[PDB]
């Protein structure tokens, strides 16, 4: 008879109980348990749940079964099983795993299906319980909880590289070349004193072939508690975790996760020579479950919105609803998000499809708001402020890993914005070296670093949406834009659009703005739909120019040159106009650039040249 050590509960009864639970169970039991019986339907609740879950798992070939604890309390049989799971998690999880495998094989055996049985026999099967009681606190873990299932909510802080954990040792003889694999128990190798071969019984002739053993994946994570659990505001404590097999690399640094595991404790050796152990035991958590806290229909909805006659103003309004009366700026930013076509050229250089916009004006107006909105919308991008230590940094820089004491090349904000929008909030205050790397990016669209023995180039195909403020307390219309902005002419000449949003004091304008602001205390689109639409268009559509567009572009450029001797427009404006027309075509999901696209692009560029 098999009995768990220190208890009086049979393993056979546990196995049969859980098998009965799995083969026969319905969600209606859970619904009645939670006092939600009136919500019971007639098809899903009356159909076997875990049998369906096993069938689908077999169809998909997966093995891990996510189990909810309450369902054990829902079935009369399994109350004791639930309590035992909460008190003796290891053995209970073991019997659960074997019962899962046994029922999996029994299903095929009974249903005489054509599915291969050898493949099923080869698989290790597992269960991942979760929601096993009110989550406790890292500061409330007393010794009473050692070897017991607990729930912890905390913020990931770090995760070590995968550790190879040994399962089966491999030994080879030096006089007969006979090999046999010996399992491992609690980290001790039961290495033989002589070959198992009768013919060659030579003693103490075993060697460990390290690369022929069997290993399993292990990883150590560090966890820190949530802010709301801090009683006064002191430094949050830290607990260490251990994740094995498919939970390895299941969470990235900085994530909020809820972890279910067994609170274990292990002795620590005093030194790496003897067997003496410190009286203080070190704790950790053995995790068994972790939680983190386009379709044809989507395509059809996208076509439906695209067919709308008033699409342009709709997207413009939806970009930043809370801002008031900045239609031109919103339209320009909407064009920037989509981005113009990118050209891969043979016999010629690469031509960038990005759009760079500078939002410069008085401090009163709303400019950081628009950058925050754009960051939210952008499928890829960063937020940064020049001369800001908080920001990661605009340029790739060589550093030393404090955790591992190694040199690592870390990419800056510009490189991490590849294919996206990098919003720089404070463009005015910038280091000269930062303004050099920015020039190299906006010109060559790559960052080259040749220090610390490394010579490498990093792609930085990212748009830029910066903001600027005047030197004084307000913008002086009399002086030119260059004098007020305090930026080199070489630098503010590269932006495709420059927007002068000025807070001129007008009775009507102030009245309207105050009314809007106080009221804050034409449909609009959700941010998720907007970002998905933008990503779809940016990944699939690639508009092309046509003869009519070619005529209108040439004519508009010539007209913009003839206005002036003073040079009104330069060849830069032609590239800006073509990029803006391409972006406007992208927004309509059109594969061609019509007269309307080029005409819209000129209207925005000419207006931008206008007050700027």
């Amino acid at each position: 008879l098999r009995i768990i050590w220190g208890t009086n509960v049979s393993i056979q009864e546990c196995t049969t109980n859980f098998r009965n639970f799995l083969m026969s169970f319905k969600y209606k039991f859970r619904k009645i348990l939670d006092e939600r019986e009136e919500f019971i339907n007639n098809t899903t609740d009356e159909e076997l749940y875990y049998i369906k879950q096993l069938n689908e798992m077999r169809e998909l070939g997966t093995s891990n079964l996510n189990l909810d604890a309450r369902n054990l309390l829902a079935y009369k049989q399994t109350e004791d099983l639930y309590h035992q799971l909460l008190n003796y998690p290891q053995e209970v999880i073991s019997i659960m795993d074997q019962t899962i495998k046994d029922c999996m094989v029994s299903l095929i055996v009974d249903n005489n299906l054509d599915y291969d049985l050898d493949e099923i026999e080869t698989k290790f099967y597992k269960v991942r319980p979760y929601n096993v009681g009110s989550c406790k606190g890292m500061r409330e873990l007393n010794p009473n909880d050692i070897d017991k299932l607990i729930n912890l909510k905390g913020l990931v802080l770090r995760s070590t590289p995968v550790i190879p954990d040994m399962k089966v040792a491999f030994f080879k003889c030096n006089v007969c070349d006979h090999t046999m694999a010996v399992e491992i128990d609690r980290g001790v190798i039961q290495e033989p004193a002589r070959c198992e071969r009768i013919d060659c019984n030579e003693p103490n002739s075993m060697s460990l072939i390290h690369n022929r053993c069997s290993f399993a994946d292990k990883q150590v994570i560090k966890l820190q508690e949530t802010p709301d659990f801090v009683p006064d505001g002191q430094t949050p404590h830290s607990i260490s975790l251990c994740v094995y097999d498919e939970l390895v690399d299941s969470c990235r640094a900085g994530d909020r996760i809820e972890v279910t595991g067994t609170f274990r404790s292990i002795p620590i050796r005093a030194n790496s020579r003897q067997r003496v152990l410190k009286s203080l035991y070190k704790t950790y958590v053995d995790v068994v479950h972790v939680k983190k806290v386009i379709t044809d229909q989507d395509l059809a909805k996208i076509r439906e919105v695209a067919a709308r006659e008033d699409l342009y103003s709709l997207l413009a309004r939806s970009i930043a609803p809370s801002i008031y009366e900045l239609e031109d700026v919103k339209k320009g930013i909407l064009l920037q998000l989509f981005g113009g076509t990118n050209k891969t050229f043979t016999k010629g250089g690469r031509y960038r499809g990005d759009i760079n916009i500078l939002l410069c004006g008085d401090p009163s107006t709303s400019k950081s708001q628009i950058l925050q909105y754009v960051h939210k919308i952008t499928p890829r991008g960063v937020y940064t402020s020049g001369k800001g230590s908080s920001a990661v940094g605009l340029t790739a820089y060589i550093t030393r890993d404090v955790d591992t004491k190694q040199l690592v090349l870390e990419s800056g904000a510009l490189v991490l914005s590849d294919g996206g929008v990098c919003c720089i909030d404070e463009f005015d205050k910038m280091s000269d070296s930062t303004r050099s790397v920015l020039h190299e990016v906006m010109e060559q669209q790559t960052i080259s670093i040749a220090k610390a023995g490394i010579i490498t180039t990093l792609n930085a195909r990212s748009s830029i949406l910066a903001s600027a403020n005047p030197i004084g307390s307000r913008y002086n219309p009399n002086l030119p834009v260059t004098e007020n902005i305090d930026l080199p002419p070489p630098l503010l000449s590269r932006f495709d659009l420059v927007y002068l949003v000025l807070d001129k004091v007008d009775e009507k304008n102030d009245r309207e703005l105050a009314k809007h602001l106080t009221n804050l205390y034409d449909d609009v689109l959700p941010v998720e739909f907007l970002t998905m639409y933008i990503s779809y268009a940016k990944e699939h559509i690639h508009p092309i120019i046509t003869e009519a567009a070619k005529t209108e572009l040439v004519r508009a450029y010539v007209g913009m040159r003839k206005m002036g001797k003073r040079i009104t427009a330069t060849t830069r404006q032609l590239e800006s106009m073509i990029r803006l027309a391409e972006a406007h075509a992208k927004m309509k999901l059109k594969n061609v650039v019509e007269l309307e696209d080029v005409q819209e692009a000129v209207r925005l560029i000419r207006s931008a040249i206008k007050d700027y």
């Binding site: 768990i4 196995t15 053995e91 073991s94 019997i95 399962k167 128990d185």
Partner: protein, 43 residues
Amino acid sequence: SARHSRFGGLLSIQTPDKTRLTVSGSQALVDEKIALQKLDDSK
């Protein structure tokens, strides 16, 4: 064993007479022939 080596499942097998022996391993937790094989091999 599906779980790692340090999972730590302990067993108590009952002899025909009222004495309990201790075995370690999930396979033992499930099976009895494996338990007896481990008993013999651990000598």
